């Protein structure tokens, strides 16, 4: 019943810059049995789905890249467990195409990943966006960002403090960025830090000049109310 | 939209006190260095003596 349309699916979006209108359909036609979950073949399909569908978010056309970041989204809300092989790959995927010029893939891109942040392990997010929030450039770095306060807003007092050391010297970093959204992204995930471990964040931020600290417990005063 | 402006104005209103403290921490640093420029030739001029 399925397996009919899969193999429909694999050899259409294996036909890179070619046949958007055929491509179109067989994504909108997976992600609508994903939505429905209808799919009862993921259990012998989503590897090869998963890559094929990676592989299209490097297509020529943009509305296809997009579309493609739709149903990743989809995929990722109604299959997350499927994921932890492919986590680190898919985030790297998600963030790339933040810096895509054509905003509609950019939209898209946002979409997925807010929803990536939920649907991967917590402590393995973390430790692959350090790197990437430190090195990387605008704005997958503010992506990640975000991210990374999403992941924080969902853990507990002994795993954020086990993951201190690798995610505070981005912050502090980034605080100091060029960009006023990178320095925002990095006061707003500094409140969720907070929002955890408390007054503990204190002695990681004894860096930070006075009316950075000023700024900071200005918005965390603002959350917790 | 509103919030990029807010956080960017409270940036601004606080940007003099920003350089001072920014100037003070370099200022800092360099009190330190000399601190121990000190205190490695007072070792040396120690051990000169005798
Ligand atoms: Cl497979």
């Given at each position: ?12 979006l294996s ?7 055929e491509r ?11 939505q429905?979950?209808?799919?009862s073949?993921?259990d ?9 569908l990676?592989?299209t978010?490097?297509?020529?056309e943009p509305?296809?890249?997009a ?10 809300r109604?299959?997350p467990?499927?994921?932890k092989?492919?986590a680190?790959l898919?985030?790297?995927?998600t963030?790339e ?6 905003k509609?893939?950019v ?29 990387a450039?605008?704005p997958i770095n503010?992506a990640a960002?975000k991210?990374?306060?999403?992941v924080?807003?969902?853990?507990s ?6 993951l201190?050391?690798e995610?505070?010297?981005?912050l ?6 060029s ?5 925002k992204a ?7 830090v907070?929002a ?10 004894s860096?930070?000049?006075g ?14 109310t | 939209?509103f919030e990029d402006l807010?956080?960017?104005?409270l940036?601004?209103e606080?940007?003099?006190?920003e ?9 800092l640093?360099?009190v330190?260095?000399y601190?121990?420029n000190?205190?490695s ?8 003596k005798?």
């Open positions: 019943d399925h397996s009919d349309l899969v193999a429909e699916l694999l050899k259409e036909n890179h810059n070619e046949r958007v209108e179109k359909i067989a994504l909108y036609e997976l992600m609508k049995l994903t429905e979950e209808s799919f073949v993921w012998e399909h989503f590897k090869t789905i998963l890559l094929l990676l592989e978010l490097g297509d020529k509305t296809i890249r579309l493609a970041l739709k149903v990743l989204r989809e995929i990722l109604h299959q467990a499927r994921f092989n492919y680190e898919t985030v790297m995927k963030l195409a933040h810096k895509d010029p054509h509609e893939v939209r898209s891109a946002e979409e997925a990943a807010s929803v990536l942040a939920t649907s991967i392990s917590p402590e393995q997010c973390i430790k692959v966006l350090c790197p990437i929030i430190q090195t450039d605008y503010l960002i991210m990374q306060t999403k924080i807003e969902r853990v007092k002994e795993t954020l403090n086990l201190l050391p995610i505070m010297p981005g502090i970093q980034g605080y100091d960025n960009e006023s959204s990178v320095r990095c006061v707003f995930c500094l409140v969720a907070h955890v471990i408390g007054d503990e964040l204190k002695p990681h931020l860096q930070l000049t009316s950075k600290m000023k700024l900071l417990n200005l918005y965390i005063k603002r959350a917790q | 939209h807010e956080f960017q104005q940036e601004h606080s940007r003099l006190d350089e001072k403290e920014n100037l003070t921490q370099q200022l640093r360099e330190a260095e601190q121990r000190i205190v030739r007072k070792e040396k001029i120690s051990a000169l005798k």
